[PDB]
Every structure is written in C-alpha cells, then in structure tokens.
Write a structure and sequence with these properties.
The protein contains seven helices and no strands. By secondary structure, the protein is an all-alpha fold. It has one domain. The PDB classes it as oxidoreductase. Keywords: AhpD, oxidoreductase.
Length: 133
C-alpha cells in the first residue's frame, strides 16, 4: 500500500525494457548483483528468467565465480566487472581503468544502459532484502 513506490520501481524496468543492451546480458547483470547483495528472491527470479531467455545451466552455475571461468565473452566480462564494482560501492573507489575498459566493449549509450540496469537491480535488491522477501 505504497503503490507510488512500486510504480516508481517499475518505471526503471520499463526504461530498461526499451534498452539496446541485449537481454541475456542484463539478466546476467541482475542475477550477479543479486548474488552479491544476498537477495534470494531476486536470485531465484532472474536465474529462472535467464533460463527463460535460454541460458545454460553451466553458465548459470559459473556466474557466482565468473571471473575464473572461460564461459563468458569479453563484452560480458566487462559488464560483469562494472556490475561487481558498482555493487560493492560501499567498500571501494572504482578502479580508474574500469570506465575506460568498459568503453572498449560498449558504446557510450550502451554504458548508460548498463549503468541503469545495475542501478535498477541494486534498488530492487534493497527492497527485497529490507522487506524479508
């Protein structure tokens, strides 16, 4: 019964849904940050969503540890490092190179889309965790 809240939160996923970032990738972004933030609700949602959109079990189980795995592409790995360091903003400055490295795999407008995706899920993880979903 804060409907003004739920919809402010949907207006992000409404923009993301119009975003030129490929959906399998924003699902890896959502699933990975939900791992880091401990939203079990979000992890179960997007995990299955990613299944929906055709992800393999092998990559799904490797994302928890993607850094060490060959299963993700350079473009994926660059979005996953952005998402990892923006999830852990509490702990660290971002490394200076991160923005530059990102530009070697995404055009400027993809980066803003990547960034709203990661911000949107960081928001949702906080609603989930806070309300014991």
């Amino acid at each position: 019964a804060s409907p003004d809240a739920y919809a402010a939160m949907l207006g992000l996923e409404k923009a993301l849904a119009k975003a030129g970032l490929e959906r399998p990738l924003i699902e890896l972004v959502y699933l990975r940050t939900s791992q880091i933030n401990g939203c079990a609700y979000c992890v179960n949602m997007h995990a299955n969503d990613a299944r929906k959109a055709g992800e393999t079990e092998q990559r799904l189980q490797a994302l928890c540890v993607w850094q060490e795995t060959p299963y993700f592409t350079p473009r994926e790995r660059a979005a996953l490092a952005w998402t990892e360091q923006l999830a852990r903003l509490s702990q660290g400055p971002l490394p200076h190179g991160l923005l530059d490295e990102l530009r070697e795999h995404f055009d400027d407008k993809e980066i803003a889309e990547l960034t709203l995706a990661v911000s949107a899920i960081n928001a949702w993880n906080r609603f989930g965790v806070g309300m014991g979903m």
